[PDB]
């Protein structure tokens, strides 16, 4: 029973570990104005590239 | 207690409340009259 | 600043947006945007700290260049079979550039980069006037030009707004930023439905305006730029805080509260059409925003565990700071779900 | 279990084990032994609180690094469980067969 | 005074009422020396108003019930623990310097509000400015932790940013610990616990500091004289306005803001006067704070629902 | 009876049950249809009854 | 039904406006007066489920569960006092107000015809509970076990709205009456897969199946006794209830889709029934007990024999009163010595010689004693499941033996074997405790005479 | 640890307790338990099953006396029904 | 949607045609609940101002309640108008188009066949 319970809160701890490293999906931001601005401009022209063929 | 002054909201203002109750009378009776007349003309749009 | 001039400016902002709504000609609408910028630069910066200056600049660049891109799309409309009116654009491309343009005017996914920054820079009242009023014009244009909208774009920009903008705000302890990212999420919804049944878009627009209205007004009541400020006010006076939290859950769309109503109707008129998968793909992210906001709801309790609540800060004198219409909008954004047969009054 | 070998206790183990052991013991005996008037409620002893908190599984939420752990737990809920899946589905399908064909000889069954 | 912004567009009264004799003045003396003879004295002759001794019961007796209730709501001061040497960090200093400091700021905003509102100048007990050399000299040797110069100093700056320089200041130089002997003479045993080094470093850093502040903000009339009662009634009273009005040109400071005044600046100060909870907020601010004024919320909350006098109400006759 | 002022706190919810009950009894009038018209139950209206219920 | 909706809504201002010290008297009084008419609610007859108004109606099952709720408020509120009995008035009126509003949304939920009104009122039921247990729960570190608890709910509990609205626009009306008679068979495929799984798991989060049962224990140790009797006497029966109704459709699907969940509940019944044997800290034992009986309920729901429902609902009610009461015993023991840990004190056959009879009696009613309604329901469920699989009785009756063992182990070592004699605090009984116990058992023993009230719609 | 001095004793702080036990013991034990227990003790025939007994008796008697085999299965007459075809 | 209907006479709040629709009775539960909503409005106002609530609510509360009854009343009226024209549009477009929407005869269960897997 400690196996199913520790595996249950270990899997939920794999979701919060996925929330821990999902904060990395938030921390994937480098907080650099030369990153999200110019990368959002290039990948925005890639929204007109994907929208060019979409 | 309250030796300082009368803080403005402390004592009532009888002109303001008079105007507010004015709005109550005007607004409410206007609503009732609206109801009566709309029901009347609604009766006119159809017949007995 | 002068207490007249603010009236002679705000009057011109109201006027500008009224022109964007009224005019049937493109060049006018373009002018209405120009006047809302020109007159909205003084409202921000009201206090002369540099934060409002740099932030007001970041608003001015992207907002103005957005306007110019709008003009470009208008002109391409003139190229292709064309006249100056407000109606379905005759170019697919002009519609593309115009959906991008109105996607800068109001915060959207590729273009949202400025909103958090500018919202924290400028003061409270400018924060209110930025995230609500100026948000009326672009929707009022999109409602018009929707017939030529390429579905794939606005659907995309909507989703990416919800995913990106909503997913954001996590580490943020600031308030103005939170209000910004939430603005971008409600954006993702209002624009998501836009092509199907715009009535719902104006709905989530109005409800949203009430939401941010009570929110910022409460931040004027208890002057708070952080969550720490929220807790410290909880030990100053409770009521304003629980109004802030309850309105935040209404900002999360939690079922009994009134914020759940636009989500719920959007799910009806979204899913009576064919695609059922995309609404769920929105509702997931909606849960994300939720339990973030409910982290901000474990910001509080009673028999609290230690928040370091300090002192001096009991006070014998009530505050006279004038709160314009707080109560009507508080109850009106909490209690509204038992209404809406009233939905159709809107359109 | 089964006291044996009748240990010679040596010297250190005598001095150390005796003096230190009964040292700490008598320290704590006398400690909770105060038993004065004027205490209305429980004696509260910090013992058994450690029992409770630890047995609330303090390492449960953190993680479970692999080692042999995932094998003991997975194989602990594996063999009997999934086999019982197979047997109830088996006897299930058999029951359905003998109902749909031949006879199960239910005759009067009714309330089911 | 510009109650609402509509009062402005209705009337400009901030500029209309100016006596030319008002400005703003702060009497100063090192502890127990100058005190009330100068401020009360010019309040007699010159005719401006006067704020009495600052402390707990200034902010306490300002509003709410008529005059103060006990400090258990605040739990502050009991200056016997101020006077001697309680270097320990428990209730010894923090409550005292912060609580009385916010009392000082509130006093100052009260001064400006009264001035602009009624158009009659006032004199101030101690400036908000005398207090940074006061406290800086209190921690300058012990009797409190470091980080109090930081917390309290940032409160100094951030707070004071928008108010005023106010024009002139009167200070009397204590002649080398004489008052440290004269405080022996006052007949207040709890007070005599003070030592000399603190007091005289207070006054040394006081002069050597504010003199660059004096020249740095407007002008001052500072005296080392021989019974400032009569020295007052001659040089302070006569020379005050005599060379004040003409001397105010070299003041600058409030000469530029008051030079504009009317709309804009005067509107913002006058508008920022009312609702003290707005001005003291920044003093209330740093809601982080530290374990300094920290009260586990049960104390001030049980004080809230246990709030006596005005608790539920603003002005209500339900209770006395 | 006027002395209920002394007990006035109590009379509330009884008036609650009465009030809601009368609201259901009126509600039935809005729901009223098929009064004699259902196939199981058809009656020739009794001389003193123009209504089954 | 509206005649039951007003009187509680009027019971709100009764609380708010009142003199201090009379709030408990007024609330208790008028609340029992509600319970009378709750007992009026039984007209149910023949075949057609009575319908009060086109908005919401009652079949059988809604009627027993509802009677249990309106009965349960006055006893609950009656029990919650002396947990505090010191505070500002605003705390008291706030708390009683919250219990009221909670009851209101419960009545909404059980009576609700149309499943979307059921769902809105559903989460609208969950919020007040959350406010109760979090705002003051005695808060061991608080665990933050109210809030992300609400995330345990909504996480997979939201999409059932999606699936619903789908059912809405495809078939039109979501009225339950007309969803009946229009229900049409749904073949087994991958779309019906995600749908059935959606609705099923959506409710199955509430009555914890062994997979998700980590939900209950923390939330129920952190709950103040009022929030506990709320939680485990009712808030599971909401999930099982809505399950009862929405299983109307999903007709063939629930076979191939049911089988894994059935397996998991038959095994987890035994597992949970085991883990609840060895733990300390009494407040948890009854929790995992609730998990066990609820697993048995799910087992009863998926297999669709009518016997399965009769025993099922019988188990909903009987377990409601039993579990609720037994909690309130744990609390009445907790006020004596502040522990929550079982093994700490002992005795109480010597001391509190009466409180014995309520320990014994209640534990026996959770021991599945033959005339007790708990054994009626559990018995019929065992009959149904044995009809489904001749083999499963090994697992079932094994739960009989284990449930016997812990259910009778709780009866000891709290209540028997020695007095720990370093206590010298416990004050003998109360009249209130006896009132609470009595108000629990006495109806549970009387129902063991005329049970046909509490057996389900099919009877 | 507040306990009571146990001057007499009950639910709450003194002098209202007697009223408290009076209302809870009365409205709780007297009215609902005894009264209600008599109500649902015998209320009108529940679920109709008594009527079911009577009707069953009459119908069975008819079925034997007129010689028809009782309980014919076929819940609906195949005389009126139609069947799909391959 | 529907803007072609009401764009013929723009910014008519409700048209001269609407008066043929029965107006909501006073006691209509909706606008009454709106009145309650003004009650909780004013209550939260008296919570904002530190005054104890139930005081000053003699004129205030009545002002709130009556205001929301007013506004909410007109809103309900124009609403019922909106659904009126909606249903009208439906039925007209129904009748005018036989082919688009076929009227089929619904055959009785006598001809029906299903699978209906029993349990067992
Ligand atoms: C027989 C029918 C078949 C039964 C099949 C099962 C048999 C075994 C049952 C389990 C063991 C029972 C037992 O003795 O437990 C010890 C338990 C307590 O004994 P104790 O704690 O050792 O001694 C009491 C104290 O020491 C000192 O206190 P005291 O001596 O001053 O007073 C003793 C007595 C004082 O009485 C009261 O307090 C007044 C109660 C008023 C009830 C009004 C209704 O009781 C109490 O104080 C509390 C217990 C009563 C609670 C309410 C009734 C519970 C009934 C439990 C089932 C019935 C068992 C015996 C049946 C015999 C045939 C009738 O005794 C009972 O439970 C007997 C209750 C007798 C009173 C009611 C009699 C009539 C009730 C109606 C019919 C009930 C039929 C129930 C069917 C089964 C349901 C589960
Ligand atoms: C402090 C003393 C405590 C004593 C506790 C009880 C001890 C056991 C012995 C009791 C002996 C006296 C019983 C009452 C006298 C009448 C007996 C009689 O004529 O029976 C045949 C008589 C047959 O005449 P009938 O009207 O042609 O038949 C109606 C059918 O029996 C209708 O069919 P049915 O299926 O409803 O069958 C009735 C059956 C089943 O009834 C139920 O199961 C009722 C369930 C209520 C659930 C409420 C849930 C609330 C949430 O109940 C009984 O047979 C009586 C046992 C329950 C008594 C409960 C007393 C309050 C607690 O039975 C009845 O009429 C039933 C009467 C209604 C039930 C309540 C009666 C008791 C009222 C309170 C009396 C308390 C004891 C007084 C002191 C006694 C010692 C000094
Ligand atoms: C749609 C309408 C959208 C309204 C957006 C906000 C407009 C007010 C702007 C105020 C500007 C400002 O500086 O205010 C600060 C002041 C307070 O800040 P202050 O006092 O520091 O500064 C103001 C300075 N003077 C006085 C000189 C102008 O007021 C407020 O903050 C009050 C805000 C009230 C907002 C009310 C929103 C109502 C929404 C109703 C929607 C109904 C839809 C119905 C559809 C059918
Ligand atoms: C004088 C014109 C002023 C125009 C500027 C003021 C409006 C912008 C600021 C407030 C925005 C409010 C929310 C969005 C609009 C809500 C529309 C609405 O409820 O209209 C009701 C009705 C709608 O009028 P209508 O239906 O006759 O025509 C407008 C049609 N729509 C808006 C659907 C495109 O408005 C009136 O009756 C006004 C009189
Ligand atoms: C769904 C419908 C819900 C109801 C919507 C209608 C709102 C109507 C306005 C409510 C105003 C309440 C009010 O007046 O509160 C009083 C308070 C000030 O008190 P007062 O009596 O004015 O005296 C001053 C002394 N302190 O007031 C204040 O402090 C603020 C005053 C606010 C003034 C503006 C009122 C605007 C009224 C028209 C709104 C129309 C909206 C219609 C569309 C709604 C769409 C959702
Ligand atoms: C009717 C009389 C209403 C009396 C209201 C309460 C009076 C009072 O003094 O309330 C004080 C209280 C604020 O106290 P405070 O300590 O600040 O608590 C804040 C914590 N949230 O403030 C409050 O309690 C807030 C107000 C509560 C109002 C309760 C509801 C009043 C009745 C209307 C609802 C019922 C309508 C029923 C309609 C018929 C049925 C359909």
């Amino acid at each position: 029973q400690k196996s199913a319970s520790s595996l249950l809160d270990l899997i939920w701890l794999e979701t919060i570990l996925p929330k821990t490293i999902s904060l990395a999906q938030m921390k994937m931001s480098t907080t650099i104005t030369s990153q999200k601005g110019l990368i959002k401009l290039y990948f925005l022209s890639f929204l007109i590239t994907i929208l060019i063929s979409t | 207690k309250f030796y300082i002054q009368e803080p403005p909201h402390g004592s009532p203002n009888w002109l303001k409340v008079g105007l507010t109750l004015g709005t109550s009378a005007f607004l409410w009776i206007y609503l009732i009259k609206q109801h009566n007349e709309d029901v009347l003309e609604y009766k006119r749009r159809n017949g007995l | 600043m002068n207490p007249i001039i603010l009236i002679i400016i705000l009057m011109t902002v109201m006027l500008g947006t009224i022109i964007v709504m009224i005019s049937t000609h493109w060049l006018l609408i373009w002018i209405g945007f120009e006047m809302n910028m020109l007159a909205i630069i003084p409202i921000m910066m009201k206090k002369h700290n540099p934060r409002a200056t740099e932030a007001s600049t970041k608003y001015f660049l992207t907002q103005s260049t957005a306007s110019m891109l709008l003009m470009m799309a208008i002109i391409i409309n003139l190229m292709f079979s064309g006249q100056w009116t407000v109606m379905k654009l005759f170019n697919p491309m002009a519609s593309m550039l115009m959906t991008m343009a109105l996607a800068m005017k109001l915060g959207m996914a590729p273009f949202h980069f400025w909103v958090p920054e500018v919202t924290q820079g400028i003061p409270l009242s400018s924060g209110l006037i930025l995230l609500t009023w100026q948000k009326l014009a672009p929707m009022s244009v999109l409602y018009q030009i929707l017939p030529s909208i390429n579905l794939d774009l606005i659907l995309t920009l909507s989703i990416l707004s919800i995913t990106i903008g909503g997913w954001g705000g996590l580490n943020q302890t600031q308030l103005r930023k939170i209000m910004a990212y939430s603005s971008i999420a409600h954006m993702g919804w209002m624009t998501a439905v836009l092509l199907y049944n715009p009535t719902m878009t104006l709905l989530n627009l109005i409800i949203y305006i009430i939401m941010t209205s009570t929110m910022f007004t409460l931040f004027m009541a208890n002057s708070t730029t952080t969550t720490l400020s929220l807790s410290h006010t909880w030990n100053k006076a409770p009521i304003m805080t629980i109004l802030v939290l309850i309105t935040l859950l209404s900002m999360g769309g939690l079922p009994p509260l009134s914020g759940f109503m636009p989500k719920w109707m959007i799910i009806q008129e979204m899913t009576k059409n064919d695609s059922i998968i995309l609404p769920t793909l929105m509702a997931i992210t909606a849960l994300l925003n939720l339990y973030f906001y409910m982290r901000l709801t474990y910001s509080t309790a009673l028999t609290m565990f230690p928040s370091t609540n300090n002192m001096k800060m009991k006070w014998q004198f009530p505050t006279t700071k004038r709160m314009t219409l707080l109560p009507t909008m508080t109850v009106l954004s909490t209690m509204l779900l038992p209404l809406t047969p009233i939905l159709s009054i809107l359109e | 279990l089964d006291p044996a070998e009748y240990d010679i206790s040596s010297e250190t183990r005598k001095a150390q084990a005796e003096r230190l052991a009964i040292r700490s013991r008598l320290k704590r005996e006398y400690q909770l032994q105060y038993n004065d008037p004027s205490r209305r409620g429980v004696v509260e002893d910090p013992a058994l609180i450690r029992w409770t908190c630890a047995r609330s599984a303090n390492v449960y939420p953190n993680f479970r690094p692999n080692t042999k752990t995932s094998l003991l737990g997975a194989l602990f809920g594996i063999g009997p469980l999934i086999f019982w899946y197979y047997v109830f589905k088996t006897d299930r399908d058999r029951k359905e067969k003998l109902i749909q064909e031949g006879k199960l000889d239910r005759t009067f069954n009714i309330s089911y | 005074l510009q109650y609402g912004p509509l009062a402005y567009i209705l009337g400009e009264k901030t500029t209309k009422k100016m006596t030319e004799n008002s400005k703003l003045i702060t009497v100063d003396g090192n502890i127990c020396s100058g005190k009330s003879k100068l401020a009360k004295e010019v309040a007699e002759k010159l005719g401006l108003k006067h704020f009495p001794e600052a402390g707990i019961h200034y902010a306490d007796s300002t509003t709410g019930d008529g005059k103060p209730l006990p400090v258990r709501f605040s739990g502050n001061c009991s200056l016997e623990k101020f006077y001697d040497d309680p270097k320990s960090n428990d209730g010894n200093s923090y409550r005292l310097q912060a609580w009385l400091y916010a009392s000082r700021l509130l006093q100052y905003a009260d001064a400006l509000e009264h001035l602009l509102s009624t158009g009659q100048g006032v004199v101030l007990e101690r400036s908000i400015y005398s207090d940074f050399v006061f406290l800086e000299a209190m921690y300058r040797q012990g009797f409190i932790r470091k980080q109090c110069v930081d917390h309290y100093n940032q409160v100094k700056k951030v707070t004071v940013c928008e108010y005023l320089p106010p024009h002139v200041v009167i200070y009397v130089d204590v002649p080398v610990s004489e008052v440290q002997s004269r405080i022996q003479k006052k007949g207040n045993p709890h007070e005599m616990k003070i030592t000399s080094a603190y007091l005289q470093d207070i006054e040394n850093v006081y002069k050597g500091t504010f003199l660059p502040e004096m020249s740095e903000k407007c002008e001052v009339l500072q005296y080392s004289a021989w019974e400032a009662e009569d020295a007052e009634k001659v040089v302070e009273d006569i020379q005050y306005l005599k060379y004040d009005k003409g001397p105010w040109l070299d003041q600058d400071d409030r000469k530029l803001h008051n030079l504009r005044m009317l709309v804009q600046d005067k509107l913002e100060v006058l508008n920022y006067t009312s609702i003290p909870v707005f001005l003291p907020e920044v003093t209330i601010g740093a809601h982080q704070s530290d374990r300094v004024f920290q009260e586990f919320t049960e104390l001030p909350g049980r004080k809230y629902r246990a709030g006596y006098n005005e608790d539920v109400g603003d002005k209500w006759i339900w209770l006395k | 009876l006027q002395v209920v002022r002394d007990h006035w706190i109590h009379v509330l919810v009884p008036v609650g049950f009465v009030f809601g009950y009368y609201l259901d009894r009126k509600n039935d009038e809005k729901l009223a249809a098929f009064r004699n018209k259902s196939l199981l139950y058809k009656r020739e209206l009794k001389p003193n009854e123009e209504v089954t219920w | 039904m509206l005649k039951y909706i007003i009187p509680t809504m009027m019971l709100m201002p009764l609380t708010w406006l009142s003199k201090n010290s009379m709030i408990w008297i007024n609330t208790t009084l008028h609340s029992l007066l509600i319970s009378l008419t709750s007992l009026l609610l039984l007209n149910q007859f023949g075949d057609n489920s009575l319908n009060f108004s086109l908005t919401f109606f009652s079949d059988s099952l809604s009627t027993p569960l509802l009677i249990l709720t309106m009965w349960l408020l006055p006893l609950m509120l009656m029990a919650s006092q002396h947990h505090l009995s010191k505070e500002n008035l605003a705390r008291k009126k706030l708390f009683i107000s919250m219990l009221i509003l909670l009851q209101l949304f419960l009545i909404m939920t059980f009576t609700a015809t149309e499943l979307i009104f059921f769902y809105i009122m559903f989460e609208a039921t969950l919020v007040p509970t959350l406010i109760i247990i979090t705002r003051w729960g005695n808060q061991t570190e608080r665990l933050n076990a109210g809030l992300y608890f609400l995330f345990y709910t909504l996480a997979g509990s939201l999409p059932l709205l999606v699936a619903l609205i789908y059912i809405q626009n495809t078939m039109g009306s979501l009225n339950f009456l007309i969803l009946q008679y229009w229900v049409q068979p749904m073949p087994n495929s991958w779309s019906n897969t995600f749908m059935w799984l959606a609705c099923m798991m959506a409710f199955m989060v509430k009555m914890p199946l062994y997979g998700l049962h980590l939900w209950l224990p923390k939330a129920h140790v952190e709950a103040p006794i009022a929030g506990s009797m709320v939680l485990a006497a009712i808030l599971l029966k909401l999930g099982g209830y809505g399950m009862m109704r929405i299983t109307l459709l999903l007709n063939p699907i629930t076979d191939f889709m049911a089988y894994p969940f059935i397996m998991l509940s038959l095994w987890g019944m035994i597992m949970t029934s085991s883990i609840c044997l060895r733990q300390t800290d009494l407040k948890s034992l009854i929790a995992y007990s609730s998990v066990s009986h609820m697993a048995l309920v799910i087992v009863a729901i998926l297999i669709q024999t009518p016997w399965s429902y009769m025993g099922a609902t019988a188990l909903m009610i009987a377990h409601g009163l039993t579990s609720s009461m037994l909690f309130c015993l744990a609390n009445s023991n907790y006020e004596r010595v502040h522990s929550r840990t079982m093994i700490l004190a002992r005795g109480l056959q010597t001391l509190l010689p009466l409180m014995a009879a309520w320990w014994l009696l209640a534990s026996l009613t959770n021991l599945a004693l033959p005339p007790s309604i708990n054994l009626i329901g559990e018995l019929f469920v065992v009959m149904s499941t044995f009809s489904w699989s001749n083999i499963t009785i090994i697992l079932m009756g094994l739960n009989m033996v284990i449930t016997a063992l812990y259910s009778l182990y709780m009866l000891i070592t709290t209540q028997r074997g020695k007095h720990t004699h370093h206590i010298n605090n416990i004050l003998p009984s109360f009249t209130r405790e006896n009132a609470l116990m009595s108000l629990h058992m006495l109806p549970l023993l009387l129902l063991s005479l005329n049970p046909k009230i509490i057996l389900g719609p099919l009877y | 640890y507040e306990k009571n001095p146990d001057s007499h004793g009950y639910d709450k702080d003194p002098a209202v307790d007697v009223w408290n036990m009076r209302v809870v013991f009365f409205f709780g034990f007297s009215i609902v338990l005894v009264l209600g227990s008599t109500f649902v003790a015998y209320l009108p025939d529940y679920r109709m099953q008594e009527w079911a007994r009577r009707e069953a008796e009459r119908l069975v008697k008819y079925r034997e006396a007129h010689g028809l085999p009782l309980m014919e299965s076929n819940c609906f007459d195949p005389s009126k029904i139609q069947l799909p075809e391959d | 949607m529907m803007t072609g209907r009401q764009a013929r006479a723009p910014l008519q709040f409700l048209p001269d045609e609407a008066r043929s629709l029965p107006p909501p009775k006073l006691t209509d539960p909706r606008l009454a609940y709106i009145g309650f909503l003004g009650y909780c409005s004013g209550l939260i106002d008296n919570a904002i101002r530190r005054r104890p609530v139930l005081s000053a609510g003699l004129h205030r509360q009545f002002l709130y309640i009556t205001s929301f009854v007013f506004v909410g009343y007109y809103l309900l009226k124009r609403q019922d108008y909106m659904y009126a024209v909606r249903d009208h549009d439906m039925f007209s477009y129904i009748k005018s188009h036989p082919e688009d929407f076929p009227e089929k005869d619904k055959k009785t269960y006598r001809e029906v066949f299903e699978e209906f897997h029993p349990v067992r």
Side-chain angles (χ1 to χ4, degrees), chain G residues 9-15:
Chain G
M9 190 167 178
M10 296 294 184
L11 174 57
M12 178 67 74
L14 172 69
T15 66

mmCIF file of all heavy atoms in Angstrom, chain G residues 9-15:
data_model
loop_
_atom_site.group_PDB
_atom_site.id
_atom_site.type_symbol
_atom_site.label_atom_id
_atom_site.label_comp_id
_atom_site.label_asym_id
_atom_site.label_seq_id
_atom_site.Cartn_x
_atom_site.Cartn_y
_atom_site.Cartn_z
ATOM 1 N N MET G 9 -33.255 30.309 2.830
ATOM 2 C CA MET G 9 -32.835 31.634 2.399
ATOM 3 C C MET G 9 -33.301 32.687 3.396
ATOM 4 O O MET G 9 -32.578 33.647 3.681
ATOM 5 C CB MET G 9 -33.371 31.900 0.994
ATOM 6 C CG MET G 9 -32.827 33.135 0.307
ATOM 7 S SD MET G 9 -33.245 33.088 -1.451
ATOM 8 C CE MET G 9 -32.567 34.634 -2.050
ATOM 9 N N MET G 10 -34.494 32.504 3.963
ATOM 10 C CA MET G 10 -34.928 33.312 5.092
ATOM 11 C C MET G 10 -34.129 32.989 6.342
ATOM 12 O O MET G 10 -34.019 33.825 7.243
ATOM 13 C CB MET G 10 -36.411 33.080 5.371
ATOM 14 C CG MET G 10 -37.360 33.511 4.275
ATOM 15 S SD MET G 10 -37.376 35.290 4.018
ATOM 16 C CE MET G 10 -38.663 35.438 2.785
ATOM 17 N N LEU G 11 -33.593 31.775 6.434
ATOM 18 C CA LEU G 11 -32.790 31.421 7.593
ATOM 19 C C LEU G 11 -31.455 32.147 7.593
ATOM 20 O O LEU G 11 -30.793 32.202 8.632
ATOM 21 C CB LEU G 11 -32.616 29.903 7.637
ATOM 22 C CG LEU G 11 -31.719 29.185 8.632
ATOM 23 C CD1 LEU G 11 -32.116 29.527 10.038
ATOM 24 C CD2 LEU G 11 -31.882 27.701 8.399
ATOM 25 N N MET G 12 -31.047 32.707 6.455
ATOM 26 C CA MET G 12 -29.858 33.559 6.435
ATOM 27 C C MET G 12 -30.020 34.838 7.258
ATOM 28 O O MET G 12 -29.223 35.060 8.189
ATOM 29 C CB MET G 12 -29.483 33.843 4.980
ATOM 30 C CG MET G 12 -28.301 34.756 4.805
ATOM 31 S SD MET G 12 -26.785 34.001 5.383
ATOM 32 C CE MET G 12 -26.496 32.815 4.078
ATOM 33 N N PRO G 13 -30.998 35.713 6.988
ATOM 34 C CA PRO G 13 -31.093 36.940 7.786
ATOM 35 C C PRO G 13 -31.483 36.688 9.220
ATOM 36 O O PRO G 13 -31.166 37.518 10.082
ATOM 37 C CB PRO G 13 -32.162 37.754 7.054
ATOM 38 C CG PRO G 13 -32.993 36.741 6.397
ATOM 39 C CD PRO G 13 -32.041 35.684 5.950
ATOM 40 N N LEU G 14 -32.179 35.586 9.503
ATOM 41 C CA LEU G 14 -32.365 35.160 10.883
ATOM 42 C C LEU G 14 -31.037 35.133 11.620
ATOM 43 O O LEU G 14 -30.911 35.664 12.728
ATOM 44 C CB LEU G 14 -33.006 33.780 10.928
ATOM 45 C CG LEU G 14 -33.013 33.286 12.370
ATOM 46 C CD1 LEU G 14 -33.975 34.109 13.186
ATOM 47 C CD2 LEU G 14 -33.313 31.815 12.475
ATOM 48 N N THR G 15 -30.036 34.492 11.021
ATOM 49 C CA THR G 15 -28.684 34.559 11.556
ATOM 50 C C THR G 15 -28.215 36.000 11.644
ATOM 51 O O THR G 15 -27.931 36.508 12.734
ATOM 52 C CB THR G 15 -27.734 33.756 10.681
ATOM 53 O OG1 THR G 15 -27.641 34.383 9.398
ATOM 54 C CG2 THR G 15 -28.274 32.377 10.494
#
